[PDB]
Amino acid sequence: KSRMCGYCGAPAPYATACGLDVCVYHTHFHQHCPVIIWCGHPAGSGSCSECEPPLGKGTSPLDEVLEQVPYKPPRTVIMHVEQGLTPLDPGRYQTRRGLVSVRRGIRGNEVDLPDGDYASTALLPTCKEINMVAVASNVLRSRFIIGPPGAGKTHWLLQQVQDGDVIYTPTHQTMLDMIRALGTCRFNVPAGTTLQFPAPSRTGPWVRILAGGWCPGKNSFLDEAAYCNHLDVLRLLSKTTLTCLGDFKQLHPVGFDSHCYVFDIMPQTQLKTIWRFGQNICDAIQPDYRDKLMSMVNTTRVTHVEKPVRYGQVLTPYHRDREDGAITIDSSQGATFDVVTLHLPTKDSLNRQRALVAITRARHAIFVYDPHRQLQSMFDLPAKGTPVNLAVHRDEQLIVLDRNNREITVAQALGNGDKFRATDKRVVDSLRAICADLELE
Amino acid sequence: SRMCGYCGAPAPYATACGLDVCVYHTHFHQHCPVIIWCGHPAGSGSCSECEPPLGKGTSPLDEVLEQVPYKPPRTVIMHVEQGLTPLDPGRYQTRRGLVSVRRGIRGNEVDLPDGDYASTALLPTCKEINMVAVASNVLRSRFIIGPPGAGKTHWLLQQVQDGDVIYTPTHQTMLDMIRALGTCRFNVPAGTTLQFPAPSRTGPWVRILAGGWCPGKNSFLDEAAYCNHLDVLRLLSKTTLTCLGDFKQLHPVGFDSHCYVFDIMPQTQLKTIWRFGQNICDAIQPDYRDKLMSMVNTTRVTHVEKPVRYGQVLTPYHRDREDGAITIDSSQGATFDVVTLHLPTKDSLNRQRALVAITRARHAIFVYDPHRQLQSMFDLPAKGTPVNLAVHRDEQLIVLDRNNREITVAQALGNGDKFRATDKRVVDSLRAICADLELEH
Ligand SMILES: [Zn+2]
Ligand SMILES: [Zn+2]
Ligand SMILES: [Zn+2]
Ligand SMILES: [Zn+2]
Ligand SMILES: [Zn+2]
Ligand SMILES: [Zn+2]
């Protein structure tokens, strides 16, 4: 029945409002939110003889991380205490006589408060289940795998996960992405997803949304780690070690300056062999990666157009510029296409991470429309030729670009004696069907 | 009431082979005996009606039947009791000539009042064959010659409607059809030693050729040069066909060549090849009218002086199979990345079986021909490939450089030549292995 302190796992009679469990000493070293102490007041408040002592800065990295998660206090609901029953929700409240926990009874909700009216604040779930001792060691027992785009980190996970293992992943979407590279996996469809999830096949490794806390398994993995909420990572490292796959040079987490500090003190190894694009792309993105990248595939065509084009998937920075099937660059992390157009109509719109992702989505050809010459400032991606015939869909119509980017017909492509380049199944199926009809007409 | 298979007139008799004959045609089926007005077979001077001698028939059918000799069954005894016998349904020749043994909720449903009659069963060989309609229906059908790797089965997907039917000659061919189709109705055959998917019942049908005709809108014949001559006739007794095949690949088992009907149908040939290089295309071009064009890189040809075991090993004779090698005839419609042709026995290679063997692999073929059998049929020179092949041996991925030297994937990454595979399991190994080289070393 006794809680241990999340900073100093000594006995923890108290709790922050956010709410981490603190000991008698650490009540004055959590400047992130108030902590009510032995007297009815919060520490630091000059309200009496006990809350008079001043607060101090905390030495934990947890403190430094809360500096980017501002405390939004919820408003006081009031505590109407029966004989022992009260009409309130789950529990974990700070009244005025110390911490109070109301427990789920189906014969009413029971509290160990004598009959009266007490003003009560709900505790947040921000630092619940965080144990900074456990984190301190576990992080040193964990590993981080830098998978650049197209190095197949997401695949190495498959040739290593076993069915008693748990895979954590940050968003509903990345969750789904992982379900499908696995196939048979166990999971729960998140409350309030706006997507359609397969059937939870009940004989596979587990897949869980990072925000769900820790769940026991044998080995645990963190998918798209450099992107994950800092506090939910810590909630994991308070209970297990982790095998972390991600990339610092792509997108940062959505409410934070950079990636969580725990990855910076892990041992880090980086995949160097790339299965998705040509060496010219690899060379363009090399500055962001320590070890040399070696491309297993052909030169990816690079073309810089003067006026906008619509070849392949169109990627664009800002939502307002999306036309006719295009998508945001951010929404394309993890995705792969044969051909992308990089659509840059709006100025000061392309940050270095957003540029990385975009020039590494395509396999065979990228078309860059960069009137404000933004991309040259971050990546040296010179125009590059391929002596092949590109095949891509556009408005459900197979079109063919020759080695000089002229739209020609399937028939003319067979005439010019250059091979077709394409990987997408539907493109390749349209391509093979059409060549049949040409011969049988 | 039954018409005649030769002569669509009232057919009150029937050959031993299952073909309904009129009164005229009784004397013109030299393939097997048939019984007349009396109890005797014509020809046999053994009565007062069977004295006139037999005549040669003038249908192509008679000509086909010269290739399936009549094997007459040992005479069963038909125990007619209750009007029911304990023999299996069909047609028999008792005492009385024509007697039909039906389905029955009673069990058998026989006429011929009770007694115990020596019976002979008719075979199912010419059952439901109407040469009149065949004659008229061939001239309405079409034949698509699809050389190996022309993807004839792909053009078929792009034409078939849900009411259409697709016949196919073997269990294996049916499977491969079903998988290329996806959504398709079928019944798994009885006795199958293979693993069929679940018969999605919202698709075009897919039936086994020996399962006779079944209603449908448009019908199709798969690997038509390979199909049983008489089973094809059964189809042309009821509908027109669209036939996809290759006369220059295997013959139907137990026949000289393909069924004559394809010779009097219009024929067109696919010219575009998606499987092997133009070197292999040139090697087989004598067997095809129209020029073959390859859409893929050269295939390596290596003539070995010792037997090897690189890739999938093909060999003509069951006797020579060792360590997972497969006969050449088992490999029609299969595709591999690398094949080894294992030619250790003399006079083993007809022309069809070489055509098949040398058009199975995508990227490399190794020939072991110490009896120099192949040269007599196909000019298959040696050709080099500036690449590193990859293939499994015995659960172990081995790599061959551009000089056919086994190397390690480590060394492969060093010689700076791209890898060349397509098989999924091979490519996943290659990937997993390159991961482990940079991750654990
Ligand atoms: Zn403490
Ligand atoms: Zn706090
Ligand atoms: Zn106080
Ligand atoms: Zn007749
Ligand atoms: Zn017969
Ligand atoms: Zn007679």
Short mmCIF file of N, CA, C and O in Angstrom, two decimals, chain A residues 117-188:
data_model
loop_
_atom_site.label_atom_id
_atom_site.label_comp_id
_atom_site.label_asym_id
_atom_site.label_seq_id
_atom_site.Cartn_x
_atom_site.Cartn_y
_atom_site.Cartn_z
N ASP A 117 -17.29 18.49 3.58
CA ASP A 117 -17.13 18.98 2.22
C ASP A 117 -15.69 19.46 2.05
O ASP A 117 -15.24 20.35 2.78
N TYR A 118 -14.98 18.86 1.10
CA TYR A 118 -13.57 19.14 0.85
C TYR A 118 -13.39 19.48 -0.62
O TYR A 118 -13.95 18.80 -1.49
N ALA A 119 -12.63 20.53 -0.91
CA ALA A 119 -12.31 20.89 -2.28
C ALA A 119 -11.17 20.00 -2.79
O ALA A 119 -10.14 19.87 -2.12
N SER A 120 -11.35 19.40 -3.98
CA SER A 120 -10.45 18.36 -4.48
C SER A 120 -9.99 18.58 -5.92
O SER A 120 -10.81 18.85 -6.81
N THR A 121 -8.70 18.37 -6.15
CA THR A 121 -8.08 18.52 -7.46
C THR A 121 -7.68 17.15 -8.03
O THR A 121 -7.05 16.34 -7.34
N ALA A 122 -8.06 16.90 -9.28
CA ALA A 122 -7.66 15.67 -9.94
C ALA A 122 -6.18 15.72 -10.31
O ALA A 122 -5.68 16.74 -10.79
N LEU A 123 -5.47 14.61 -10.08
CA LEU A 123 -4.08 14.58 -10.50
C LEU A 123 -4.01 14.26 -11.98
O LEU A 123 -4.86 13.55 -12.53
N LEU A 124 -2.98 14.80 -12.63
CA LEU A 124 -2.78 14.55 -14.05
C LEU A 124 -2.15 13.19 -14.24
O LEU A 124 -1.73 12.55 -13.27
N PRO A 125 -2.08 12.68 -15.46
CA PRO A 125 -1.36 11.43 -15.68
C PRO A 125 0.00 11.62 -16.34
O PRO A 125 0.53 10.68 -16.95
N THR A 126 0.57 12.82 -16.23
CA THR A 126 1.78 13.16 -16.99
C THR A 126 2.97 12.33 -16.55
O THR A 126 3.62 11.65 -17.36
N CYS A 127 3.27 12.35 -15.26
CA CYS A 127 4.40 11.61 -14.74
C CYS A 127 4.00 10.35 -13.98
O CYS A 127 4.84 9.75 -13.31
N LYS A 128 2.74 9.94 -14.07
CA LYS A 128 2.35 8.68 -13.46
C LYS A 128 3.19 7.55 -14.04
O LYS A 128 3.44 7.49 -15.25
N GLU A 129 3.66 6.67 -13.15
CA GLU A 129 4.40 5.46 -13.49
C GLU A 129 5.80 5.76 -14.02
O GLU A 129 6.38 4.94 -14.74
N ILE A 130 6.36 6.90 -13.66
CA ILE A 130 7.73 7.25 -14.02
C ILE A 130 8.62 7.01 -12.82
O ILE A 130 8.33 7.49 -11.72
N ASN A 131 9.71 6.28 -13.04
CA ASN A 131 10.63 5.90 -11.97
C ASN A 131 12.04 6.19 -12.48
O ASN A 131 12.60 5.42 -13.27
N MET A 132 12.61 7.32 -12.03
CA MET A 132 13.81 7.84 -12.66
C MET A 132 15.06 7.09 -12.26
O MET A 132 16.10 7.27 -12.91
N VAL A 133 14.97 6.26 -11.21
CA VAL A 133 16.03 5.32 -10.86
C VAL A 133 16.12 4.22 -11.89
O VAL A 133 17.19 3.94 -12.45
N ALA A 134 15.00 3.54 -12.10
CA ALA A 134 14.93 2.49 -13.09
C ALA A 134 15.44 2.98 -14.44
O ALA A 134 16.19 2.28 -15.14
N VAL A 135 15.05 4.21 -14.82
CA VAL A 135 15.46 4.73 -16.11
C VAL A 135 16.97 4.84 -16.17
O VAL A 135 17.59 4.59 -17.21
N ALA A 136 17.60 5.19 -15.04
CA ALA A 136 19.00 5.58 -15.07
C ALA A 136 19.87 4.42 -15.50
O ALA A 136 20.82 4.60 -16.27
N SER A 137 19.54 3.21 -15.04
CA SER A 137 20.26 2.00 -15.41
C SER A 137 19.78 1.44 -16.74
O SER A 137 20.59 1.27 -17.67
N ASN A 138 18.47 1.19 -16.87
CA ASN A 138 17.90 0.61 -18.09
C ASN A 138 18.39 1.32 -19.35
O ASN A 138 18.73 0.66 -20.34
N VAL A 139 18.44 2.65 -19.35
CA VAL A 139 18.87 3.34 -20.56
C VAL A 139 20.27 2.88 -20.96
O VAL A 139 20.59 2.82 -22.15
N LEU A 140 21.09 2.50 -19.99
CA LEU A 140 22.45 2.07 -20.30
C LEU A 140 22.49 0.63 -20.79
O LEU A 140 23.42 0.28 -21.53
N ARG A 141 21.47 -0.17 -20.42
CA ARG A 141 21.16 -1.52 -20.88
C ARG A 141 20.34 -1.55 -22.18
O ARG A 141 19.85 -2.63 -22.56
N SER A 142 20.08 -0.41 -22.82
CA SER A 142 19.28 -0.39 -24.05
C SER A 142 20.15 -0.02 -25.23
O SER A 142 21.32 0.34 -25.07
N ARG A 143 19.59 -0.12 -26.44
CA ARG A 143 20.33 0.18 -27.66
C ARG A 143 19.46 0.97 -28.64
O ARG A 143 18.23 0.86 -28.65
N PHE A 144 20.13 1.75 -29.47
CA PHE A 144 19.45 2.55 -30.47
C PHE A 144 20.04 2.24 -31.84
O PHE A 144 21.26 2.31 -32.02
N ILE A 145 19.16 1.93 -32.78
CA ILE A 145 19.57 1.58 -34.13
C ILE A 145 19.15 2.71 -35.06
O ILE A 145 17.95 2.98 -35.26
N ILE A 146 20.14 3.40 -35.61
CA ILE A 146 19.89 4.45 -36.59
C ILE A 146 19.66 3.76 -37.92
O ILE A 146 20.60 3.27 -38.56
N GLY A 147 18.40 3.70 -38.34
CA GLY A 147 18.07 3.34 -39.70
C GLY A 147 17.73 4.54 -40.55
O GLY A 147 16.63 5.10 -40.46
N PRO A 148 18.67 4.97 -41.39
CA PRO A 148 18.36 5.97 -42.43
C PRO A 148 17.22 5.49 -43.31
O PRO A 148 16.96 4.29 -43.38
N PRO A 149 16.53 6.40 -44.01
CA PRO A 149 15.48 5.98 -44.95
C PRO A 149 15.99 4.99 -45.99
O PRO A 149 16.97 5.25 -46.70
N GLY A 150 15.30 3.85 -46.10
CA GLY A 150 15.65 2.88 -47.12
C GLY A 150 16.70 1.88 -46.72
O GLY A 150 17.12 1.07 -47.55
N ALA A 151 17.16 1.92 -45.47
CA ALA A 151 18.05 0.92 -44.94
C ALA A 151 17.30 -0.27 -44.35
O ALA A 151 17.94 -1.23 -43.90
N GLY A 152 15.98 -0.20 -44.32
CA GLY A 152 15.17 -1.33 -43.90
C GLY A 152 15.18 -1.66 -42.43
O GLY A 152 14.99 -2.81 -42.06
N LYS A 153 15.38 -0.67 -41.56
CA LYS A 153 15.32 -0.95 -40.13
C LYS A 153 14.03 -1.67 -39.76
O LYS A 153 14.05 -2.70 -39.08
N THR A 154 12.91 -1.17 -40.27
CA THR A 154 11.60 -1.74 -39.98
C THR A 154 11.53 -3.23 -40.33
O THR A 154 10.68 -3.94 -39.80
N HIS A 155 12.44 -3.72 -41.19
CA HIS A 155 12.49 -5.12 -41.61
C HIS A 155 13.38 -5.96 -40.71
O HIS A 155 13.02 -7.08 -40.34
N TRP A 156 14.56 -5.43 -40.37
CA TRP A 156 15.41 -6.07 -39.38
C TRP A 156 14.64 -6.37 -38.10
O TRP A 156 14.96 -7.34 -37.40
N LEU A 157 13.63 -5.56 -37.78
CA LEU A 157 12.82 -5.84 -36.60
C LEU A 157 12.10 -7.17 -36.74
O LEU A 157 11.95 -7.91 -35.76
N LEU A 158 11.68 -7.50 -37.97
CA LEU A 158 10.95 -8.74 -38.22
C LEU A 158 11.84 -9.97 -38.04
O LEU A 158 11.48 -10.92 -37.33
N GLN A 159 13.01 -9.97 -38.66
CA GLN A 159 13.92 -11.09 -38.48
C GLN A 159 14.51 -11.13 -37.07
O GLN A 159 15.56 -11.75 -36.88
N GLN A 160 13.87 -10.47 -36.09
CA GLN A 160 14.35 -10.52 -34.71
C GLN A 160 13.26 -10.61 -33.66
O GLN A 160 13.54 -11.07 -32.55
N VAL A 161 12.04 -10.18 -33.94
CA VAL A 161 11.00 -10.22 -32.91
C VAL A 161 10.51 -11.65 -32.72
O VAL A 161 10.38 -12.42 -33.68
N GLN A 162 10.24 -12.01 -31.47
CA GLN A 162 9.60 -13.27 -31.13
C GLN A 162 8.22 -12.99 -30.54
O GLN A 162 7.88 -11.86 -30.21
N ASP A 163 7.41 -14.04 -30.43
CA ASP A 163 6.00 -13.84 -30.17
C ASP A 163 5.70 -13.41 -28.75
O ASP A 163 4.58 -12.97 -28.49
N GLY A 164 6.64 -13.53 -27.84
CA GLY A 164 6.42 -13.00 -26.52
C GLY A 164 6.90 -11.58 -26.34
O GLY A 164 6.88 -11.06 -25.21
N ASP A 165 7.33 -10.94 -27.42
CA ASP A 165 7.90 -9.61 -27.39
C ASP A 165 6.79 -8.57 -27.61
O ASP A 165 5.72 -8.87 -28.13
N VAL A 166 7.06 -7.34 -27.16
CA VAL A 166 6.12 -6.22 -27.30
C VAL A 166 6.77 -5.14 -28.17
O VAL A 166 7.94 -4.79 -27.98
N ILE A 167 6.00 -4.61 -29.13
CA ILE A 167 6.47 -3.54 -30.01
C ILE A 167 5.64 -2.31 -29.73
O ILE A 167 4.41 -2.32 -29.89
N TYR A 168 6.33 -1.24 -29.33
CA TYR A 168 5.70 0.04 -29.08
C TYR A 168 5.92 0.97 -30.27
O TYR A 168 6.96 0.95 -30.93
N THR A 169 4.90 1.78 -30.54
CA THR A 169 4.90 2.61 -31.73
C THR A 169 4.01 3.82 -31.44
O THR A 169 3.02 3.70 -30.71
N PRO A 170 4.37 5.01 -31.96
CA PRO A 170 3.91 6.27 -31.35
C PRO A 170 2.50 6.73 -31.69
O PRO A 170 1.85 7.31 -30.82
N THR A 171 2.04 6.50 -32.92
CA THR A 171 0.75 6.97 -33.43
C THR A 171 -0.09 5.82 -33.97
O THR A 171 0.44 4.78 -34.40
N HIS A 172 -1.42 6.03 -33.99
CA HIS A 172 -2.32 5.04 -34.59
C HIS A 172 -1.83 4.61 -35.96
O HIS A 172 -1.83 3.41 -36.27
N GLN A 173 -1.37 5.56 -36.78
CA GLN A 173 -0.94 5.22 -38.14
C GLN A 173 0.29 4.32 -38.14
O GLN A 173 0.28 3.26 -38.78
N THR A 174 1.35 4.72 -37.45
CA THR A 174 2.55 3.88 -37.40
C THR A 174 2.25 2.53 -36.79
O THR A 174 2.89 1.52 -37.14
N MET A 175 1.29 2.49 -35.85
CA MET A 175 0.77 1.23 -35.35
C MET A 175 0.31 0.34 -36.50
O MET A 175 0.86 -0.74 -36.72
N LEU A 176 -0.67 0.83 -37.26
CA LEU A 176 -1.18 0.10 -38.41
C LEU A 176 -0.07 -0.31 -39.37
O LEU A 176 -0.01 -1.46 -39.82
N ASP A 177 0.84 0.62 -39.70
CA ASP A 177 1.96 0.27 -40.56
C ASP A 177 2.67 -0.97 -40.04
O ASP A 177 3.11 -1.81 -40.83
N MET A 178 2.78 -1.10 -38.71
CA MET A 178 3.57 -2.21 -38.17
C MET A 178 2.79 -3.51 -38.16
O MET A 178 3.34 -4.57 -38.51
N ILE A 179 1.53 -3.45 -37.74
CA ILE A 179 0.60 -4.56 -37.89
C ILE A 179 0.81 -5.26 -39.24
O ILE A 179 1.03 -6.47 -39.29
N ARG A 180 0.87 -4.48 -40.32
CA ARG A 180 0.87 -5.06 -41.66
C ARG A 180 2.23 -5.61 -42.11
O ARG A 180 2.25 -6.52 -42.95
N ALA A 181 3.36 -5.12 -41.60
CA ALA A 181 4.62 -5.80 -41.91
C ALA A 181 4.76 -7.10 -41.14
O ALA A 181 5.56 -7.96 -41.53
N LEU A 182 4.01 -7.23 -40.04
CA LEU A 182 3.99 -8.42 -39.20
C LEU A 182 3.00 -9.45 -39.74
O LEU A 182 3.36 -10.59 -40.06
N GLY A 183 1.73 -9.03 -39.86
CA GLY A 183 0.62 -9.87 -40.27
C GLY A 183 -0.17 -10.44 -39.10
O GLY A 183 -1.29 -10.00 -38.79
N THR A 184 0.41 -11.43 -38.45
CA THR A 184 -0.16 -12.03 -37.26
C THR A 184 0.47 -11.34 -36.07
O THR A 184 1.66 -11.50 -35.80
N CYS A 185 -0.33 -10.52 -35.39
CA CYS A 185 0.12 -9.71 -34.28
C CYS A 185 -1.07 -9.50 -33.36
O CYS A 185 -2.22 -9.55 -33.80
N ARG A 186 -0.80 -9.30 -32.08
CA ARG A 186 -1.88 -9.07 -31.13
C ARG A 186 -1.92 -7.60 -30.77
O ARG A 186 -0.88 -6.95 -30.61
N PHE A 187 -3.13 -7.05 -30.70
CA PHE A 187 -3.29 -5.64 -30.39
C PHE A 187 -4.73 -5.34 -30.03
O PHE A 187 -5.62 -6.18 -30.17
N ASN A 188 -4.94 -4.11 -29.63
CA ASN A 188 -6.26 -3.61 -29.32
C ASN A 188 -6.49 -2.38 -30.16
O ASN A 188 -5.61 -1.52 -30.26
#
